[PDB]
Amino acid sequence: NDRAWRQTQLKVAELLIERQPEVAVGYRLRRHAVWAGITAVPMSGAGNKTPLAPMSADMVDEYRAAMNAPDQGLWQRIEQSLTLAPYWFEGHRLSAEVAEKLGFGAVAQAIAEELGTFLQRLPALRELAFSDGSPFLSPECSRWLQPGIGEAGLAEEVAQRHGEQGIAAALALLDERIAQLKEPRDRFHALLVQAELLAQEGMEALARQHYQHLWQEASRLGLSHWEPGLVNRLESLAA
């Protein structure tokens, strides 16, 4: 009766979450319960597609709707579903986004550590798709998962002002700083902030585009033979 034991895990996870919903372990115990019996991916064929239809758009949209005014109640129905919709990897991205907005960084964190785990157990999943052809793992769902001294001296000096006033002022500051810089290295750092800043406001395409021009502008300057760590991240970012 793996079935019954699996109940029990969930039961304990329900309760753990109920008692402490800012604390990972319950979330973790559930993922397990849900992805226990799974030993090898579902039978696929034409275009990697699987005989399993995706999450009811209606349903997904409705969830994406609530996001602006999210509560501890939303988060529960999301989760209820990804307990019944094993492979819905996009919902594990929501759960993480929701949780992060409700104030639970650590749980978001965990939701993902545990997913990345599942994908290393059976990576065939990173390629599979639902009978409608849509991917088990989107590209925005996969960038999610993949992981200076004076650089952070401003970046942290700014992401602070990005919290007191909004993005508008964040940039406003970034500007007034740059006007008083001589060294290109610094000015390149600034522009680098601008990108990171847009990343946190939800500008995945506009941010990435700055990384592209920052990686090449660096590689062009031959920083692979001096300060290659900078260049190596820049490369990872621009994906």
For residue 171, the Cα-to-chain-centroid distance in whole angstroms is 24
Least distance CB 229 / a second copy (angstroms): 5
47 binds a second copy (CB under 8 A): no
Q: Which is nearer to a second copy, 78 or 189 (CB)?
A: 189
Contact 198, 210 (CB under 8 A): yes
> According to the binding rule CB under 8 A, does residue 235 interact with a second copy?
no
Burial of 108 (0-12, 13-18, 19+ CB in 10 A): buried
Of 25, 38, 26, 33, whose CA–CA distance to 9 is shortest?
Answer: 33
**Residue whose structure tokens are 């508008």:** 168
Does position 239 interact with a second copy (CB under 8 A)? The reply is no
Q: Report the site for a second copy in 172-231 (rule: CB under 8 A).
A: 172, 174-176, 178-179, 182-185, 187-188, 190-191, 194, 198, 201-206, 209-210, 213, 217, 221-223, 225-229
Window of 29-37, 83-91, 155-163, 165-173 that interacts with a second copy by CB under 8 A: 165-173
C-alpha atoms less than 13 angstroms from C-alpha of 63 in its C-beta half-sphere: 24
- Which residues, numbered 98-127, are part of the site for a second copy (CB under 8 A)? 106, 117
* Residue 21 CA: distances (Å) to CA of 78, 88, 106: 15, 22, 11
- Minimum CB separation of residue 167 from a second copy in Å reads 5
Closest to a second copy by CB, 7 vs 200, is 200
